[PDB]
Each structure stands twice: as C-alpha cells, then as structure tokens.
C-alpha cells in the first residue's frame, strides 16, 4: 500500500536498525519491514512479496523524484 514517498527516518532509528549507508534515504522506512522479513524468510523469492514490492515502487518514486529535479537544473542552464 504505497502511492507516494513516505516520511524520512531519524538518525537514531538507523543506528538501532543498522540500515546500510547506501540505502539511508527517504525510502529507508519501508526498508526495515522488508529487511526484517527476509532474515526471517531466508531471502526467498516468495516469502517477502508485498513488502518487497512496496519498496521497489518507493525507489521508483525516489528515482522519478530526481527526474523532475534533473530537468529543473537543465532549465537553469537556459537562464544563461
């Protein structure tokens, strides 16, 4: 059940979850339920279905966020 980017985590939260550095972003909050289930599910291709699907779409919005923000700079090239 994900349609838009969720709220960012806090600094102390990542310490207790030891979330990897490259994935400490806005979508980090939907990482924690996924990572916890994979450990209890042996990273199988079927035991984390909806939690994984929610996360990939989050990274899609997180990616599509930068597409609009990439074009915004490219317009500022046209300023001068």
């Amino acid at each position: 059940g994900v349609s838009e980017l969720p709220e960012l985590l806090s600094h102390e939260e990542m310490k207790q979850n030891k979330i990897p550095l490259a994935y400490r972003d806005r979508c980090a909050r939907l990482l924690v339920p996924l990572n916890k289930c994979r450990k209890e599910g042996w990273y199988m291709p079927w035991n984390c279905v909806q939690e994984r699907h929610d996360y990939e779409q989050c990274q899609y919005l997180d990616f599509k966020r930068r597409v609009k923000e990439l074009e915004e700079i490219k317009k500022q090239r046209d300023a001068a």
Binding site: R52, H53, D54, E56, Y60
Partner: protein, 53 residues
C-alpha cells in the same frame, strides 16, 4: 567380434537409462523457462513493473 565392411551407421540404440534421463533433465529446463516467462515476461523486458499487479 568382426568389423563389417561397407555399412551405414544405423540410428543407435543407447540404453534408455541415459536417454530418458537427458529428456527429463531437458524437460526440467524448458518447463522452468516457461514457468518463469509467464510470470516475468513483463519484468524481463521492462514493459511493466513488479508492483503493477
């Protein structure tokens, strides 16, 4: 035993111990290939997304 001079090589009859095993092994390959394809021919080509159910 003796070598028969001037003969064709007939369609060999190997023991179906080997023949059936290779057929099942090959069948295990294709069946899997089809099984993943029907469930991932969108995602493999990128035409859809995994969460576009």
């Amino acid at each position: 035993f003796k070598y028969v001079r001037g003969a064709i090589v007939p369609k060999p009859k190997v023991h179906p111990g080997y023949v059936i095993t290779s057929k099942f092994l090959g069948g295990l390959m294709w069946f899997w290939i089809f099984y993943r394809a029907k469930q991932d021919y969108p995602v493999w080509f990128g035409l859809k997304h995994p969460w576009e159910h």
